[PDB]
Amino acid sequence: MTVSFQEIHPIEIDAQWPRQPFYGFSLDSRKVETGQIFIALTSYQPEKTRTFAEAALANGALAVISETELGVANEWVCPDVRQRMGEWQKRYLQQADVVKPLRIIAVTGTNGKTTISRLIAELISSQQQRCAVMGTTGNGILPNLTPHTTLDALQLQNALHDYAKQGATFASLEASSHGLEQGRLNGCDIEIAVYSNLSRDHLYHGTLEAYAEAKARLFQFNSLKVAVINLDDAHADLMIKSAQNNPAQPKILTYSLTQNTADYYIADLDYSLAGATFNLVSQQGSFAVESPLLGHFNVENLIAALIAAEQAGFDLQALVDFVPKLIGAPGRMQVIRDDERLFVVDYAHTPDALIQVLKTLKRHVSNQLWAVFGCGGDRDRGKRPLMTQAALDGANPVILTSDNPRTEDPEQIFADMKQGIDFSGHRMHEIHDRREAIKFVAEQAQAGDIVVIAGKGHENYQEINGVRHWFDDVVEVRSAIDAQHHT
Questions:
Q1: Could you tell me which residues come within 8 angstroms of residue 29 by beta carbon, excluding any fewer than 6 positions away?
Q2: Topology of domain 96-325, per CATH?
Q3: Where are the chain's structural domains?
Q4: How far apart are CA 480 and CA 331, in angstroms?
Q5: What sign for the dihedral angle of Cα 119, 122, 126, 128?
Q6: Is 5-95 a domain of CATH 3.30.565.10?
């Protein structure tokens, strides 16, 4: 089809360009194609904007729609274009190359967006549908994803359209607060919305009410069929009320780990080296879940994902049966399983970070939770015993080892780490060579143990004497484990 702007969003204007063929919208004056219409967002250097719009006209743009008066030719001033442009681009694509629409699920929340998003995609895909996922670990059809920081509304519509062209019947999206405020999802006919949580720490520049209200905007979409809302969260009520005030009157579903009044809750939860087991209880009965995922947050995330996928027309029992096969999202922990032991390589560079991963893993450990760690050289000597204290408070045994000692005398580093510390009642070893420490725990840890190797994560060097030597914790763990199965 030939497509004109009048068919997308008709206007009264003394100009012929709205009646002409155009080839979609663009936010990029450099790479705008000929006969595309340029959208001139005022780019808060306001004087840059007019030059961008002029460059775009020079590169073949048919016209310019701007938030403000810019004095360019073939111009239409539309102050809220930032909020309508996703819809306009979707309309353009359905005019030019009509496809059957995707069914769109979106999750909003400070934490869990990626995990819930991907679990939803994985469940729906397990039921032989094809599901697209779009977020900070990638974009596309399971399993190949495209990992721009995040997409503008036009790019969102172009990708959603491409996925429909390729067979996807569903898409699972993350919805950040800034994204919602900016109109980035406005073109989307969002069927199911999920709310995970809201947390005081975010790095979003506004008052907390603006952050929460940005999120509530997701539940005002008149596309909304179902709202899936985490009851255990302080701002649940805000989300709920918007769902109630939605003209489309979507169905509201609450979930809770504790309160049995929510539409969904859980019974008899417990943890293990395999993950977690619990009963997911709803009006339709009880379902025994065998999750392969670590941590309490992932019980929450899995609950939200299962509900959203059910609400998409799939049977709860089939999804629950698929759960043991769920992969999840790449995280802060690198987990190596061997002979009923978990080895967890993790950046845990401060006392708080070490204690947090130890608290998570202590839920799962069957026998002993080990911590292996060191303290960087040529750094604050006063923080070293605090690291040791944190390890002792959360793990036993603990292994004191080396981590980027640099030019500092190792004896001083280790003396510092031990300053004022009482090791009575703890199994402690001090193993200066790091490769030696990892070999030690690899051999010594028993069935039901979890071993945290902290301090490096993906950092693949060990700095000594000014020299960064190749050193990878995961490589050493897997070597040692391999050496154990070998003669």
A1: 38, 52, 53, 55, 56, 59, 61
A2: UDP-N-acetylmuramoyl-L-alanine:D-glutamate ligase (3.40.1190)
A3: 5-95, 96-325, 333-485
A4: 23
A5: positive
A6: no
